[PDB]
Design a protein around this ligand. Structure first.
Ligand SMILES: Cc1cc2nc3c(=O)[nH]c(=O)nc-3n(C[C@H](O)[C@H](O)[C@H](O)COP(=O)(O)OP(=O)(O)OC[C@H]3O[C@@H](n4cnc5c(N)ncnc54)[C@H](O)[C@@H]3O)c2cc1C
Ligand SMILES: Cc1cc2nc3c(=O)[nH]c(=O)nc-3n(C[C@H](O)[C@H](O)[C@H](O)COP(=O)(O)OP(=O)(O)OC[C@H]3O[C@@H](n4cnc5c(N)ncnc54)[C@H](O)[C@@H]3O)c2cc1C
Ligand SMILES: N[C@@H](CCCC[NH3+])C(=O)O
Ligand SMILES: N[C@@H](CCCC[NH3+])C(=O)O
Ligand SMILES: N[C@@H](CCCC[NH3+])C(=O)O
Ligand SMILES: N[C@@H](CCCC[NH3+])C(=O)O
Lengths: 556, 556
């Protein structure tokens, strides 16, 4: 139980758009349901061996199907843990790195695997010893929030007030705690039509609290943020997306997975459940595949026999009664030739109009966590978690024990600040970061502690992603609602049935692994239903309650 | 005279933020002023040989200085015309392509060089024979606006009414026509605090006209636009930016330069004025350089003698009393080591927070303008200017005469639609565009007419730009105001004087060539002033009236 020890019922990612108890579904001893025995052993294609792909595969295998996973690049997708030269257990998190404990469906799989987690070192948490804020050449050091000048407290207070006055934050959170669905939906559904079409930035600037403060206060709020770095990158996003972040504590109480979160997908791959339908004891996704996913998918089409024909990179064509796609949504045009008649024209527009955000990270390894040392004159740590308006933006320090090498994320950038780095090689990104940090820390010799190889990523640049994660712009609620409900196919024409989607791009909470796991499980219900299956009476699943508690539809 | 023949005083790009008559300044027989003879021949460095750099060089040469232009990549910057294999006069416009005749300072140079222009083929203009709109698989063909279904006219009506009700469009345009400065500033200054912090989308959705229409109406408005393609890409931008586009007719009455707009910067380079101060007859920028700009700049610092030290790619270091930089703003951090004390901390923030937009274009050549042929059954053109929600977005047809080859821009994309193409090679971009067009035109064999080589660009990818052009996000008014005014140095500390900036990123109107020219001319005044010069009493210039009619400052 990683929840904060505050004596309350815990905040979880429980809707608010679809407040279904994924955790309870997953933990119930009846299982996720059954498929008729005569269909046991039939294949279902799953494009993408990211977390959504492998979650859907694992559970469908448990239901007595043979998932067939395809993966065009690397195992784990945006959960990716690259090992530094010559080390064991020392990694850089290139995608997902800090996992809110509200992510109960994600953590089900973490615990099923027996993996260890620890608090992530976000600013001003017990996990981080100190934080340095550097803005317009003015540098502030703090071991607790009270060490900061008054403006920073004025900003936090205004933010908390805008959420309470503007969104009924307190009431929503209590309903989440209690899992009081009618109440949560009443409270949430009111916000949906009021904020789809307005931005994060608009919410802030027009709120009472910020409107009476200087421009500089909301500016500073953009650059330094509310617990997890500056979110000026997301000022443009629809406010509903942000409401979702804060209401479900995605931005608080976060852990990193010891040894790398890539152990989650790699472990699901290899995991042998005690009880599968159909399959013999000792069966895993890996044993069913003979060890690897298939190669990348090049084409999806409807075959004359009514099945879906999937052709790989090397022209191998295989037929399936159903196909789940988990690649980011653009790839169904840019990377796969997906026959158009497989989605409605309304669906294509959702898939095609979804915006993906940009992200950069640059990492080095260091011989020891030297930042813990004290400057004798000042009493400060030699280095801190760094928030700045310089090009690095966010710098994060990873302590692996005094007797092991440290890891430093030199820069974690979003959007514009990511785009600055796009065409530059690793050596240049490192240099620029180190020069930026030398300005903030003139006395600290970081370069002198650096060992191993540097590691960078730009998710935008990779043709298998075309972005770090979705970001909902204002007015995209309708596209999301279509994509999120696509697993409910009882009213679709026959020509559109049997193909499914999932991923954090399908979810209402992109950039958060829980969104990939929950939509993945919705698709599991959908695929089960497609094979003539159904949930157990004592353990109803997504599609059994979707029509009553799913996301509101808006007007045409 | 390329202005519309409507018998009115023409709309020009006259403010509204700084309603200075650049064209009058330029055309006045007295010239732009003078610099004391004792400083004739001294050097001023100019970073970048795009339009802002070459304009500033040209005029400073005329004032008796020796500009020294640096260029790290290609001549002309974002005015780029690439010639297709084996051809003469047949180009693709990779940057700037359609130049609003309201751009009177830009067209001063076009006409000084004697270049020929013709109306650009935008949808439903005399320059275009027909337009095809393709949305959610429904295709509409039109030779005049009246051929379109009713919804499209409801959209245009609502857009025009939102501008009239919401922005006093009529009154502002009249004040622009009359060059009534007090009135224009009154009418504009009211809008500045009201729309800095709000998006284009918010302007549209909350306007009376669109709020009573369906979502689908503003959705279609995003995909199809108001004369120059769909601008859903800019829905996130501050509304002040859009107001500036429409109020100054940037989006109407556009011409292309025959033979390519790159002839403008290449012609300025080579142009020999009748009278320069100091320089002998026959002097050009080219003759003054020996033919070529210097190579790229790697560093700018304050030398111990007070001058500015500029070090090129090859380590050659040269000293200057002044330096103009015209590269896009990020490059003063990514591409040049620009000493931090050379700009104020408020300026660095403007420079570093500015957002750059993405843009893609894919072009092919064809043996003849076969699109003009008629399908005998339908009476339609074989192909039209195409607006679509497919990945191409906008397709443009260039007729060079029946006896010459045609040029087709298969796709001109912004933002997300640009990002789709980022990592893909030209061949892939062409194929995707042709497969999208096949769907819209199943009977037209475009591929069969294609000849020559394909041409693509992604401005985001190029380390000498890092974007196509700035796009002001809500709340960016203050950063633009800082950048726009930086050429006024009378109250700066000494350590910050002598460096200047210019470019369409400095301007209020990014993505428009007139913004680069006007800011370039402000920099001209600033540099003249820096060398102890002044304008002629009968021809006052930017910095002589800036304190009285320049851009309003906003509160802290
Ligand atoms: C920089 C960054 C930081 C993040 N930080 C956090 C965080 O701190 N906390 C958090 O909770 N979440 C975080 N996330 C989000 C998290 O990583 C995602 O929600 C999740 O990993 C996405 O999972 P997915 O299954 O939806 O898709 P993916 O991980 O994208 O998996 C999809 C797979 O499809 C593959 N594919 C593509 N094309 C084809 C093809 N033609 N054929 C076959 N396969 C193909 C891809 O290679 C990929 O492996 C972060 C993401 C990024 C990018
Ligand atoms: C896709 C696109 C479409 C456009 N369409 C239109 C249009 O339709 N109508 C219109 O009016 N305008 C349009 N524009 C805008 C127009 O192209 C610009 O406003 C203008 O040409 C930019 O001039 P500039 O001098 O500001 O900068 P740039 O043209 O970027 O010039 C800066 C120069 O400096 C160089 N440089 C960079 N780093 C260094 C270094 N370290 N040292 C030396 N030099 C360096 C660059 O290589 C470049 O040559 C468009 C722009 C784009 C990208
Ligand atoms: N341009 C620098 C910052 C200089 C100003 C810092 N206050 C950067 O992005 O890192
Ligand atoms: N969940 C990620 C991304 C947050 C920004 C969302 N656009 C993080 O905590 O870093
Ligand atoms: N995915 C296709 C569009 C299919 C739907 C078109 N109405 C594209 O981006 O071009
Ligand atoms: N001048 C460019 C403007 C692009 C939109 C600017 N955000 C064009 O006409 O195509």
């Amino acid at each position: 139980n990683r929840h904060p020890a505050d004596g309350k019922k815990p905040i979880t990612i429980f809707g608010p758009d679809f407040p279904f108890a994924f955790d309870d579904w997953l933990e119930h001893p009846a299982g996720l349901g059954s498929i008729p025995a005569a269909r046991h052993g039939e294949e279902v294609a799953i494009v993408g061996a990211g977390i959504a792909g492998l979650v859907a595969a694992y559970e469908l295998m448990k239901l007595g199907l043979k998932p067939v996973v395809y993966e065009a690049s690397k195992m784990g997708g945006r959960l990716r843990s690259q090992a530094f030269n010559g080390t064991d257990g020392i990694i850089a998190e290139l995608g997902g790195m800090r996992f809110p404990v509200s992510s109960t469906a994600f953590y089900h799989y973490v615990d099923k695997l027996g993996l260890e987690t620890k608090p992530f070192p976000n600013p001003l948490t017990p996990a981080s010893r100190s934080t340095v804020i550097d803005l317009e050449g003015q540098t502030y050091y703090a071991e607790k929030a009270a060490d900061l000048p008054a403006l920073f407290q004025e900003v936090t207070d205004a933010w908390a007030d805008a959420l309470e006055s503007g969104a009924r934050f307190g009431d929503i959170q209590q309903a989440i705690r209690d899992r009081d669905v009618p109440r949560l939906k009443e409270l949430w559904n009111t916000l949906v039509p009021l904020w789809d079409d307005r931005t994060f930035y608009d919410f802030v600037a027009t709120s009472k609290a910020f409107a009476k403060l200087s421009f500089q206060h909301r500016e500073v709020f953009g650059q330094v943020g509310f617990g997890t770095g500056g979110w000026d990158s997301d000022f443009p996003n629809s406010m509903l997306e942000i409401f979702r972040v804060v209401m479900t504590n995605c931005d608080d109480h976060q852990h990193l997975v010891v040894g790398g979160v890539e152990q989650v997908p790699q472990g699901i791959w290899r995991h042998v459940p005690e009880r599968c339908a159909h399959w013999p004891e000792g069966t895993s996704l890996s044993s069913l595949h003979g060890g690897a996913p298939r190669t990348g998918v090049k084409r999806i089409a409807r075959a004359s026999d009514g099945r879906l024909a999937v052709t790989d990179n090397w022209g191998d064509c295989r037929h399936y009664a159903a196909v789940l796609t988990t690649c980011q949504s653009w790839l169904l045009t840019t990377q796969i030739d997906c026959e158009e008649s497989l989605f409605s024209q309304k669906m294509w527009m959702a898939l095609d109009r979804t915006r993906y955000m940009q992200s950069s990270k640059t990492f080095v390894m260091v011989d020891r966590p030297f930042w813990k040392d004290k400057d004798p004159e000042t009493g400060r740590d030699l280095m801190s978690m760094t928030l700045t308006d310089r090009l690095t933006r966010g710098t994060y320090l990873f302590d692996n024990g005094d007797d092991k090498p440290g890891v430093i994320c030199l820069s974690y950038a979003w959007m514009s600040d990511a785009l600055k780095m796009l065409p530059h090689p690793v050596e240049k990104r490192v240099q620029l970061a180190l020069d930026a940090l030398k300005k903030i820390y003139p006395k600290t010799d970081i370069a002198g502690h650096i060992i191993g190889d540097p590691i960078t990523i730009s998710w935008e640049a990779d043709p298998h992603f075309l972005g770090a994660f979705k970001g909902a712009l204002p007015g995209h609620y309708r596209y999301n609602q279509r994509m999120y409900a696509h697993f409910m196919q009882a009213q679709m024409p026959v020509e559109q049935r049997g193909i499914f989607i999932a991923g954090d791009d399908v979810s209402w909470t992109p950039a958060w692994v829980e969104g990939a796991v929950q939509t993945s499980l919705n698709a599991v219900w959908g695929i089960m239903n497609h094979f003539g299956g159904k949930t157990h009476a004592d353990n109803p699943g997504p599609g059994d309650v979707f029509d009553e508690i799913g996301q509101i539809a808006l007007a045409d």
